[PDB]
């Protein structure tokens, strides 16, 4: 895959790819397997999400999942007989192979260093940058021949102490992304590299009201040393039911939002390939405003020439947004799907 001069994703053939995507969680958690396999058959659940119109999937994972003898949990083996005995690595192998056989694009995502919380930086007190890079190379090495695997989202949701272009090696996400980029492309040179934003930054940023991995402002001062034809920018953005930012409370709302989205990520759409790695919310099951907010975001995305991204999420059991499926793991939120098809232009 690559990025052409029109900021479009093209495949090996040279045809434009459109990512009608959604996030599928589980592999980055204590269970070390995609969620819902207590309620559903994994193959049938994939079949369903393609049928709704999705052709792309973002797969969070964690280091533990990639280890040889890590066992999965919460799997109902009555509904999932062909996973019995398999290690979580072998289940990941089998899931990526299934997406591939169905012709569904897969963006792998290094979500958490410890199968729990999301780290501020690319390293912790028990997970070094060396381990981080090695794990990226491991994944790239393993799946580099799986045609429909798109590439790698280097690290999920940088925030807190993370900075960009300050000259401080311990916190500069931009430089860490360059090193992650180099590692992945050395092994899988046809993979795309997805890079997320940070939050508040001491330089080249108007701060405040920023979501994790949501600020790309410092890119204007400090370009990424990542090949133009591989770099995919993938910030996150959420609405009122994730956090009540002050601007949500504004009387102007939601007319005030486009300037804020423009500032945080939007202004880069015209010169960089860009999509949202995560966006979503309860869509009226949670608030009056989240309906309005999601509608406005789609309207703004369409206007910036953006008709792709990865909705958050497939799974219901995401605190604070819900998903495409309801809590019965079978019923589909039709209004959420109508919103996405609007975004996709379908
Ligand atoms: O596929 P390339 O020509 O962008 O490297
Ligand atoms: O198999 P890994 O997680 O040690 O790279
Ligand atoms: O049912 P399969 O995927 O194990 O052949
Ligand atoms: O992963 P945490 O829960 O220790 O932050
Ligand atoms: O298992 P790792 O994270 O040390 O590669
Ligand atoms: O000092 P650095 O962050 O530019 O390496
Ligand atoms: O770095 P930009 O300003 O050319 O997008």
Swiss-Prot record:
<feature type="active site" description="Nucleophile">
    <location>
        <position position="278"/>
    </location>
</feature>
<keyword id="KW-0624">Polysaccharide degradation</keyword>
<dbReference type="GO" id="GO:0008810">
    <property type="term" value="F:cellulase activity"/>
</dbReference>
<dbReference type="GO" id="GO:0030245">
    <property type="term" value="P:cellulose catabolic process"/>
</dbReference>
<dbReference type="GO" id="GO:0030247">
    <property type="term" value="F:polysaccharide binding"/>
</dbReference>
<feature type="active site" description="Proton donor">
    <location>
        <position position="157"/>
    </location>
</feature>
<keyword id="KW-0677">Repeat</keyword>
<keyword id="KW-0119">Carbohydrate metabolism</keyword>
<keyword id="KW-0136">Cellulose degradation</keyword>
<keyword id="KW-0732">Signal</keyword>
<keyword id="KW-0326">Glycosidase</keyword>
<comment type="similarity">
    <text>Belongs to the glycosyl hydrolase 5 (cellulase A) family.</text>
</comment>
<keyword id="KW-0378">Hydrolase</keyword>
<protein>
    <recommendedName>
        <fullName>Major extracellular endoglucanase</fullName>
        <ecNumber>3.2.1.4</ecNumber>
    </recommendedName>
</protein>
